[PDB]
Amino acid sequence: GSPEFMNKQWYLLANQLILSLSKYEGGHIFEKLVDAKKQNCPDYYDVIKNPMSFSCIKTKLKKGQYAYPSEFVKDVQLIFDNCSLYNTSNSVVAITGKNIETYFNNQLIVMGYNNFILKEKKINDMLKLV
Numbered sequence: 001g002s003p004e005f006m007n008k009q010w011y012l013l014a015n016q017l018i019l020s021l022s023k024y025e026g027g028h029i030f031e032k033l034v035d036a037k038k039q040n041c042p043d044y045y046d047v048i049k050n051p052m053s054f055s056c057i058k059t060k061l062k063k064g065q066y067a068y069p070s071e072f073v074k075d076v077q078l079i080f081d082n083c084s085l086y087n088t089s090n091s092v093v094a095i096t097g098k099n100i101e102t103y104f105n106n107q108l109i110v111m112g113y114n115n116f117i118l119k120e121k122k123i124n125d126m127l128k129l130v
């Protein structure tokens with residue numbers, strides 16, 4: 001397809017997808033960066049050195065700071081990885097995090113978003129062939 005047209009497309013799906021995650025059940029705990037004091041987890045940024053939240057990703061989208069479709073997924077997946085790292089598997093937060101992660105990955109399938117990630121790869125090979 002048209003290269004800039006494609007970029008407009010997956011940008012639209014990303015902005016849609018981050019919004020669905022904000023409204024999904026429990027998504028509000030990933031909306032903002034954790035305030036270690038107000039959540040009384042005062043060791044959070046001793047454990048999590050690469051913090052990420054839905055609002056950070058929204059700002060990147062708004063600022064046009066994603067060059068590839070995989071870069072958006074990587075940031076969302078980072079939220080889920082921080083969540084499972086910090087919270088024990090039998091905790092409310094860990095369980096909530098795995099529920100949103102399953103939903104995010106399934107939206108990637110339903111929305112055709114993964115085809116944009118596949119496209120990104122072959123273009124970079126097509127560029128390697130030059």
Ligand SMILES: Cc1ccccc1-c1[nH]c(C)c2c1CCCCC2=O
Pocket residue numbers: 028029030034039041044082083086087093
């Ligand atoms: C549980 C909660 C409520 C309101 C705002 C943020 C949170 C939250 N969101 C994450 C990803 C958290 C926490 C605090 C509990 C332990 C640390 C954590 O992973």
